[PDB]
């Protein structure tokens, strides 16, 4: 249905350890396509997906150039925040930015994002209207007034509505052969005893894309989500994902429990059982 373009910035101040570190990673949907690390000795935005090697040098020095001047702007912002929050140089601080766009079957903009964080907490976010700001504390409220006076939201709304969605389309065509490809999960179920009268049944989902999946357990046609351990959806390491859901059942009753795997990669939601 939807497709997303997002960039993730991380600024970390390293006190006495030199100038601060700047990282930029870009994602299309659930696939990472670009990367930048100020520490890395390349001094360049680098492709993190094979379909990106299609782009020429003109694309990358541009992409390096912006990410370099952004590293500078974020170097100043680190000091500014330190001033707002009355912090000392001794401590290491982190500011985050995530921005990007969702698009619908139209190709037109579905939604747009531009948010910031300081030391792991909301700082400032652009609202869904793309014309107003949500500032977490009163230090963020300062930035908000400046930003309103500077007309930042118009500039952002313009990048999001225009530039963001064009390149999203463009990246989608470049990586069409995998980004629009759907990977169904590999589903097995496993048994591991706990006690002389209890066992753990585990529903596996292997090598699927995208990351959105649903692993439900039920007994006799009625789900028991109260008695279910379930991991975070993790990376398989090759681009795809894996997740599992477990349930403590009596060692006497195994067939009475059925797992239900739901994924966009599958034509029909499939069910598994211990054999």
């Amino acid at each position: 249905g939807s497709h997303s373009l997002r960039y993730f910035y991380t600024s970390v101040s390293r006190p006495g350890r030199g100038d601060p570190r700047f990282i930029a990673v870009g994602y299309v949907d659930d696939t990472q396509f670009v990367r930048f690390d100020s520490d890395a000795a390349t001094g360049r935005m680098e492709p993190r997906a094979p379909w990106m090697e299609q782009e020429g040098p003109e694309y990358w020095d541009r992409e390096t150039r912006t990410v370099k001047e952004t590293a500078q702007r974020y170097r100043v912002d680190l000091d500014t925040l330190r001033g707002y929050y009355n912090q000392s140089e001794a401590g290491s601080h982190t500011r985050q930015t995530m921005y990007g766009c969702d698009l619908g079957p139209g190709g037109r903009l579905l939604r747009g994002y531009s948010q910031d964080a300081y030391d792991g907490a909301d700082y400032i976010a652009l609202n869904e209207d793309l014309r107003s700001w949500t500032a977490a504390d009163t230090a963020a409220q300062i930035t908000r007034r400046k930003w309103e006076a500077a007309g930042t939201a118009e500039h952002d709304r313009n990048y999001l509505e225009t530039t963001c969605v064009e390149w999203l389309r463009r990246y989608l065509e470049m990586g069409k052969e995998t980004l629009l490809r759907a990977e169904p999960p590999s589903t097995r179920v496993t048994r591991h005893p706990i006690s002389d009268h209890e066992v753990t049944l585990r529903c596996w989902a292997l090598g699927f894309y995208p990351a959105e999946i649903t692993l439900t357990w039920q007994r006799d046609g009625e789900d028991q989500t109260q008695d279910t351990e379930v991991v975070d959806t993790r990376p398989a390491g090759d681009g795809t994902f894996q997740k599992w859901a477990a349930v403590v059942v009596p060692s006497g009753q195994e067939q009475r429990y059925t797992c239900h795997v739901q994924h966009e990669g599958l034509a029909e939601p499939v069910t598994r059982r211990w054999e």
Binding site: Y7, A24, G26, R62, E63, T66, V67, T70, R73, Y74, V76, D77, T80, L81, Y84, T97, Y99, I142, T143, K146, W147, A150, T152, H155, D156, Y159, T163, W167
Partner: peptide, 9 residues
């Protein structure tokens, strides 16, 4: 394409 400009805090 990454946004060319960011507004300082």
């Amino acid at each position: 394409r990454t946004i060319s400009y960011t507004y300082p805090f």
